[PDB]
Structures are given as structure tokens and as C-alpha cells.
Amino acid sequence: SVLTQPPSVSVAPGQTARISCSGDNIGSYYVHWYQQKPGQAPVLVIYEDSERPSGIPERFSGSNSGNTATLTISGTQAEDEADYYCSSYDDPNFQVFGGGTKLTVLGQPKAAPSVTLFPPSSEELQANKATLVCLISDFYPGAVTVAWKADSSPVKAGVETTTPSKQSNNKYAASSYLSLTPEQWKSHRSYSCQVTHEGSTVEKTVAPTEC
Amino acid sequence: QVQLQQSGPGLVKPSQTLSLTCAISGDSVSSNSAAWGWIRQSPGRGLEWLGIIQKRSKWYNNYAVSVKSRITINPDTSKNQFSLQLNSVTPEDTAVYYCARYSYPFYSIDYWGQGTLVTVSSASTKGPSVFPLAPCSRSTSESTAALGCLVKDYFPEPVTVSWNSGALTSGVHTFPAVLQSSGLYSLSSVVTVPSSSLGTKTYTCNVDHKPSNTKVDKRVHHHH
């Protein structure tokens, strides 16, 4: 089974965050919630749909009904900023995790990503290689979804995408790399770099007919 | 309390066998009140369950579908440990590996190991190929254009990129490298430059990879 989570949820300090975990009849089994900060092992914050283990602040709350399990945080603290994973149990496998959700506590205004897409250089083509370079900078919060396309069909093969990282201006940067053969670059009529940042998709496109 | 000490090599050659060990303290591996398993997490990615073992009437195990053909979790009832073993490894098996204790009856995880980063790579020390990054059919309408350098396929970190021998620092943005499946890194560095001076002003990146003695300058040719 698959537990679908939103990639990103942002929230201002002291306001309520809600993180979903959709799935086909996930309300029929118990759901656990784990908090994970970078460099650390995850921490259980909610078990049995809505129960808080010892130590877990009461501002954390849980729910589960039908096809949607929801982790809710009231008066979100800055320290609550982390990754939130839900987990349950179908059949026959023992455990399944949701894709995860980055929860950001706003410390600065939201900022749309700057996307630049570079085509392969002629030098690389001479060396019998082809690489598309998609650069994403100055976005906040630091969570993006990169989607490559050939003409109109999505491409996953040869795609290497970095993890978002803080810049010197406290905003975030990321970059995706598409490795191709020159025949592949010359075959297709177009290539696109789709970058989704909180429901907003910025798209950049290159074509082999531009030089 | 309960302690979970992870152990094993951090680097594994591709198609070999990944092996880790979770030494338990403050509990028994053959406990009837707990279950033990492994969970991994690819860098910058999400949690994924690998397998589990528990002793009821007898020893039982359950493995995730995609590793089941390669995964083996064996409880060492002597040294009070349980192991993880992945045959025929591949670069997508590169991740942080956590061992964990599942608490009855809800099977929630109260205790984790410190987690060991394991890399599946046979990468050797290599110098990068430096290619220019320049937009083709530009035809700008704004007072800003972007150009840069692609530093592809090098090992290991780091690589130092400068522009015009250090004379150009403003508007310079070097991006954190990517770790490709090959085990090699690729990096980009770009500059925000005025578009009104693209015809006369020149821009050259100075890439330096010390481990391979790479000292390459590359003038970024502007297209018009």
C-alpha cells in the first residue's frame, strides 16, 4: 500500500499546522506519527491514531477516519520544524511509511524559486555526452518538487536531484541534473524542467533547435 | 534504558553484500514483548521499512517486497544482537540504516539505533570535465543574464570555483554538488551579470580540483 503525504507544509509561529496522510481505507488500521530532524533518528509523537506517548507536548494531536489520517499541531513552535512521517499496516507487509512532509515554521516571507535551465554545451557533445542542468535558487520554504519532461511525457531516467540547502540569505537552493546521450538530445523536440513550490509550478524549457 | 548500538562498514562496493549489526542493551532480542527490524533512509529522502523479526511461538520474519529477494535479518541470541544483510547491492541501496524496536501491542517504535550511513560506491579519485553553461537563443528584455560552468564527474569533495581570478564575487552562486549513482560528484556555479555588457565584458570560471590536480580555466562564450 501507499500512504500519500504532501511534500511540504509551511506555517507561521503560533498557528495551526495540519498534515495529511491519504490512503485507501487507512482508517481501518491504526496510524503512527514520527518526527525527524536532520542528523537524528525519528521520534514517535503519536501512536494509535491519536495517543501521545510520554514527553510529547499536548499541542500535538492526531486523527484517522476513512481515507484520511491527519496530524495536527496547535500553536506550532519553531522547534516543531522537522520531517513528519506517518505509518500504518496493510497486508501482508508489516509496515508502510508515507512519503514524508517537511514542516516549515516561517522565519521569513515565502519566496518563489528562480529557475534556470541550461542545455548541453557543444564541448560536451564533442565528448559524446549530454547533460541538462536545472538550477533552483532563492526559494522559501526549502522544499521543491522537480519534474523533468521530454516533449510532454515525464522523464525519470538519468535524473539526479540534490537536497535543498540554506543559502547565505537564509533562503534555499537546489539543482537537478538530466544525463542524456546526444542522440536522445537530438531526437526529442523539447525538454522541460518543472519545479513545483507549494502548488505553484515554474517551468523552464530548452530545445536542440536553439543553436 | 534500552540501547541499540549499530555496527558495520560505511562503504560497500556495488554488487557486494551490505552487512550491519544492532547490539542490544537493556533488553533481549528473544523478547516476547518486542519486535526488531531495520529501516533505511536514502539521503534527502523518506523512510522505508526493510524487514522485521520477532519470537512468538517460534521465530517469525517479514520483509519488504523489493528487498525480500536479497534481504536477511538474523537474530543472534548469543551476543544479543540482530543483523541486516543485503546481497547484490546497488547505488540505490546507499542510505542511512536504522535498527529499531517495535513495542507491543501497537508495534510503535520507542527505540532506535544511532543509524549508520552506508554508501554503495566503487568511485575512484577522478578529475572533472569543465563545460560552459550558456543560454542559446537568449534575446533578453531584462538587465540580467545568467552564465556558468558545469563541473561534471569528479571525486572526491571539494572543488573550488572562482570567477575572473577572484575579481568577480558579486552575483556569484556556486551550488552544492550532486552525488550521482556512479559515485561521482557534479557541481554548477553561475553568475548574475548585466546583459548590457555581454558583448564586451568577459567571464571565465577558475575550477580547481586539488585531489586530481585539476587547474582549469574556462571562458564562458556568450551566444547572440
Whether residue A34 contacts residue A85, with contact meaning beta carbons closer than 8 Å, is answered with: yes
User: Cα(B218)–Cα(B203) distance, rounded to whole angstroms?
Assistant: 9
What DSSP string runs through A1-49? --BB--SEEEE-TTS-EEEEEE-TTGGGS--EEEEE-TTS--EEEEBTT
Phi and psi at residue A141, to the nearest 5°:
-75, 165
What would the 3-class secondary structure string for chain B be?
CCEEEEECCCEECCCCCEEEEEEEECCCCCCCCEEEEEEEECCCCCEEEEEEEEECCCEEEEECCCCCCCEECCEECCCCEEEEEECCCCHHHCEEEEEEEEECCCCEEEEECCCEEEEECCCCCECCEEEEECCCCCCCCCCCEEEEEEEEEEECCCCEEEEHHHCECCCEEECCCEECCCCCEEEEEEEEECHHHCCCCCCEEEEEEHHHCEEEEEECCCCC
Please report, as a single letter, which amino acid is at residue B158. Answer: P
Query: What spatial distance separates the first Cα and last Cα of chain A, rounded to whole Å?
Result: 47
- Name the burial class of residue A111, with classes exposed (0-12), middle (13-18) and buried (19+) by CB atoms within 10 angstroms of its CB: middle
DSSP class per residue in A45-65: EEBTTTBPPTT--TTEEEEEE
Rounded to a whole number of angstroms, the distance from the CA of B54 to the nearest CA of chain A is 12
Q: Are residues A144 and A188 in the same domain?
A: yes
* Residue B213 φ/ψ region, left for φ over 0, alpha for ψ in the -120 to 50 degree band, beta for the rest: left
Task: Indicate if A170 and A147 belong to the same structural domain.
Answer: yes
Query: Do A48 and A68 share a domain, yes or no?
Result: yes
Range of the domain at A189: 108-208
| Helix (H), strand (E), coil (C) string for A62-114 | EEEECCEEEEEECCCCHHHCEEEEEEECCCCCCCEEECCEEEEECCCCCECCE
Q: Would you tell me how many other CB atoms lie within 10 Å of the CB of residue B167?
A: 8
Neighbour tally for A188: CB within 10 Å: 16
Q: Where in chain B is the domain with CATH 2.60.40.10?
A: 1-122, 123-220
Grid cell locating B212: 586530481
Name the nearest CA neighbour of A90 among B49, B195, B187: B49
| Euclidean distance between CA atoms B201 and B197, whole angstroms | 5
Dist. CA B89–CA A31, nearest whole Å: 31
Q: Can you give the C-alpha Rg of chain B in angstroms?
A: 25
Which grid coordinates belong to B219?
571562458
The Cα A206–Cα A168 span in angstroms is 29
Q: Do A91 and A151 belong together in one domain?
A: no
Is B184:B149 a contact under the CB 8 Å cutoff?
no
Inter-residue contact B94 to B182 (CB < 8 Å): no
Mark out chain B residues that contact chain A at CB-CB < 8 A.
37, 43-44, 46-49, 52, 62, 64-65, 98, 106-110, 112-115, 129, 131-137, 146, 148, 150, 152, 173, 175-181, 186, 188, 190, 223
Q: Which residues in chain B are closer than 8 Å to A210, comparing Cβ atoms?
A: 136-137
Final residue before a domain boundary, out of A107, A129, A149: A107
- DSSP three-state, residue A153: strand
CA closest to B106 among chain A residues: A48
* Residues A117 and A103 grouped into a single domain: no
Q: Do A102 and A112 sit in the same domain of this protein?
A: no
Residues of B123-134 as b/e, b for ≥16 C-beta within 10 angstroms?
A: beebbbbbbbbb
How far, in Å, CA of B73 to CA of B63, rounded?
9
Which residues 6+ apart lie within 8 Å of A38 measured at CB? none
Query: How far is residue B204 from each of residues A101, B133, B162, measured CA to CA in Å?
Result: 41, 11, 8
- Residue A37's CATH number: 2.60.40.10
Query: Coil, strand, or helix at residue A199?
Result: coil
Of B29, B130, B41, nearest to A123 by C-alpha is B130
The owner of cell 549530454 is A130
Alpha-carbon radius of gyration of chain A: 20
Domain count, chain A: 2
Answer yes or no: are the C-beta atoms of B109 and B46 closer than 8 Å. Answer: no
Signed CA dihedral, A39, A44, A46, A47: sign only: positive
Q: How was this structure determined?
A: X-ray
Dihedral sign, Cα of residue A75, residue A79, residue A85, residue A87: negative
> How distant is the Cα of A18 from the closest Cα of chain B, in angstroms?
19
Q: Same domain, yes or no, for A134 and A145?
A: yes
- How far is residue A135's CA from residue A141's CA, in Å, rounded to a whole number? 16
Residue A19: CA atoms inside 13 Å, Cβ hemisphere, count? 37
Give residues preceding each break in chain A, C–N over 2.5 A.
Answer: none
Examine the domain organization and report whether A67 and A161 are in the same domain. Answer: no
Q: Grid coordinates standing for B143? A: 538587465
In angstroms, the separation between the Cα of residue A27 and the nearest Cα of chain B is 15
Residue in B50, B22, B37, B48 with CA at minimum distance from that of residue B115 = B22
Q: Is B181 exposed, middle or buried (0-12, 13-18, 19+ CB in 10 A)?
A: middle
How many angstroms separate the CA atoms of B108 and B222, rounded? Answer: 58
Residue A185 DSSP symbol:
H
Instruction: Give me the half-sphere count of Cα atoms (radius 13 Å) on the Cβ side of residue B87.
Output: 6
- Look at residues A64, A86, A107 and tell me which one is the last residue of a structural domain: A107
Query: CATH 2.60.40.10: does it fit domain B123-220?
Result: yes
Which residue among B110, B133, B150 sits closest to A44, beta carbon to beta carbon? Answer: B110
Which class would CATH give B1-122?
mainly beta
- Residue in B with minimal Cα distance to A208: B136
Contacts of B63 (CB under 8 A, 6+ apart): B50, B51, B52, B71, B73
CB A124, CB A130: distance < 8 Å: yes
At residue B164, φ and ψ (nearest 5 deg) are: 55, 50
A171 forms beta bridges with: none
Q: Is A100 in the same domain as A8?
A: yes
Query: Which of A87, A107, A127 marks a domain boundary?
Result: A107
Contact assignment for A160 to B134 by CB distance below 8 Å: no
> How many angstroms separate the CA of residue B109 from the nearest CA in chain A?
7
Separation between Cα atoms, residue A108 and residue A141, nearest integer Å: 9
Q: Looking at the structure, tell me whether residues A103 and A139 fall in a common domain.
A: no
Exposure of A58 by Cβ count < 10 A (0-12 exposed, 13-18 middle, 19+ buried)? exposed
CA distance A28 to A131: 47
Q: How far apart are CA B143 and CA B150, in angstroms?
A: 24
Other residues' Cβ atoms within 10 Å of the Cβ of residue B223: 12
Give me the residues paired with residue B108 across strands. B103
* Beta-sheet pairing, B116-120 with B11-12: parallel
Three cell numbers, residue B163: 570567477
How far is the CA of A159 from the CAs of A134, A155, B180, in angstroms?
11, 8, 9
Q: How far apart are CA A148 and CA B127, in angstroms?
A: 28
If one counts every other C-beta atom within 10 angstroms of the C-beta of residue B219, the result is 11
C-alpha B27/C-alpha A130 separation (Å) is 55
Q: Beta strands A114-118 and A96-97: pairing type? A: unpaired
Both A103 and A4 in one domain: the answer is yes
Instruction: Name which of B118, B129, B100, B179 is nearest A177 in CA terms.
Output: B179
Tell me how far apart the alpha carbons of residues A46 and A63 are, in angstroms, rounded to a whole number: 10
One-letter amino acid of A195? V
Q: A99 and A113: one domain?
A: no
